[PDB]
Ligand binder design. Structure first.
Ligand SMILES: Nc1ncnc2c1ncn2[C@@H]1O[C@H](COP(=O)(O)OP(=O)(O)O)[C@@H](O)[C@H]1O
Ligand SMILES: N[C@@H](CSC(c1ccccc1)(c1ccccc1)c1ccccc1)C(=O)O
Ligand SMILES: [Mg+2]
Length: 333
């Protein structure tokens, strides 16, 4: 199966409006096209146009991303496949907005209902909605690690010091897999446990940002949720499934400070060019993503872009990068 690639353009922000920014991006959700105006003052007609698996314009809301992209992927996780979604694009374009989301200010909504909530919390909410006493015995475990300068931090660890480091090893049980030694995996017994877990993770990240330069823009964030499902149907026979979903928020594409982003590009180039050796081992991120990139996990990429003329070169870089990645084949479960 080819990696599926979608584009999400964010709306203008107040500073862009204040600077009287013009748009250089047109999205056509129906034709699944994004068309970028490239000639500035000089050449009013030149464009580059790309077709993707889906295209989300500035008016797309969090709930539309969920319904279109995540729901189908989560149903596949529930069938016991492994899936990955990662966000790629320049700092400021909405990777974290998309993957995690934000809380609406002054208290207006519950987390399960917040319209600014992104992929991670909606996914956790749906896992419990879908599975709960609906016949299956099931458990859910989460982990959240971040890669910065090729060091690995555990945002969910009971340790009060976020700087305490994890270590990665090959997994002798699983050919393309790693063991993250020290990684706290929290059993989430029900939906009413979700928020406090995410909240404490976010507070550890805020600390991390005070400790390390340009932390949030240089970091890669790797949230994983594993679902163990058990069934005893018609004979009394017992049929076990395990689904895993990785939700990944990459370093800003404008970027050992950068080894993982660099190596991901070299890995994607190797896969599309079909070159014989693919350098997964040369970074922490690509070791973590090995199975998602030419392996047995179903992968989707959300490429995030700004609409503003100012960001022309990086917007074009992001679209070219993401477009070629459609050519990568995985073979799920
Ligand atoms: N689709 C969107 N709709 C509304 N605001 C958005 C959207 N995407 C991003 N933003 C806003 O733009 C700013 C940067 O988003 P952020 O998620 O921090 O980007 P990144 O993680 O790619 O650096 C934030 O203020 C965020 O609320
Ligand atoms: N993106 C925000 C956190 S948004 C987030 C969240 C979502 C996924 C993982 C961790 C936190 C949140 C913010 C603040 C307190 C708790 C949780 C969130 C936003 C909306 C609904 C549910 C969770 C940040 O970088 O701090
Ligand atoms: Mg971010």
């Amino acid at each position: 199966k080819n990696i599926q690639v979608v584009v999400r353009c964010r709306p203008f922000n107040l500073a862009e409006r204040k600077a009287s920014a013009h748009s250089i991006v047109e999205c056509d959700p129906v034709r699944k096209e994004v068309s970028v105006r490239t000639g500035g003052l000089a050449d009013k007609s030149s464009r580059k146009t790309y077709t993707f698996d889906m295209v989300f314009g500035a008016s797309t809301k969090q709930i539309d991303v969920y319904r279109s992209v995540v729901c189908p992927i989560l149903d596949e996780v529930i069938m016991g496949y492994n899936c990955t979604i990662f966000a790629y694009g320049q700092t400021g374009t909405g990777k974290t907005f998309t993957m995690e989301g934000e809380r609406s200010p002054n208290e207006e909504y519950t987390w399960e209902e917040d319209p600014l909530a992104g992929i991670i919390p909606r996914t956790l909410h749906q896992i419990f909605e879908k599975l709960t006493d609906n016949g299956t015995e099931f458990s859910v475990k989460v982990s959240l690690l971040e890669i910065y300068n090729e060091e690995l931090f555990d945002l969910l660890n009971p340790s009060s010091d976020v700087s305490e480091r994890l270590q990665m090893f090959d997994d002798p049980r699983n050919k393309r897999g790693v063991i993250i030694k020290g990684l706290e995996e929290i059993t989430v017994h029900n939906k009413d446990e979700v928020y406090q877990i995410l909240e404490k993770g976010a507070a550890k990240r805020t600390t991390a940002a005070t400790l390390m330069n340009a932390y949030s823009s240089r970091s890669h964030s790797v949230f994983s949720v594993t679902i163990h499902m058990k069934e005893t149907t018609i004979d009394g026979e017992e049929l076990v499934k395990i689904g895993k979903l990785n939700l990944v928020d990459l370093a800003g594409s404008e970027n050992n400070i950068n080894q993982s982003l660099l190596t991901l590009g070299r890995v994607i180039t190797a896969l599309v060019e079909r070159t014989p050796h693919v350098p997964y081992r040369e970074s922490k991120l690509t070791r973590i993503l090995q199975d998602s990139l030419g392996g047995r996990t179903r992968t989707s990429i959300i490429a995030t872009i700004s609409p503003a003329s100012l960001n022309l070169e990086e917007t074009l870089s992001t679209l070219e990068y993401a477009h070629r990645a459609k050519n990568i084949l995985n073979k799920p479960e």
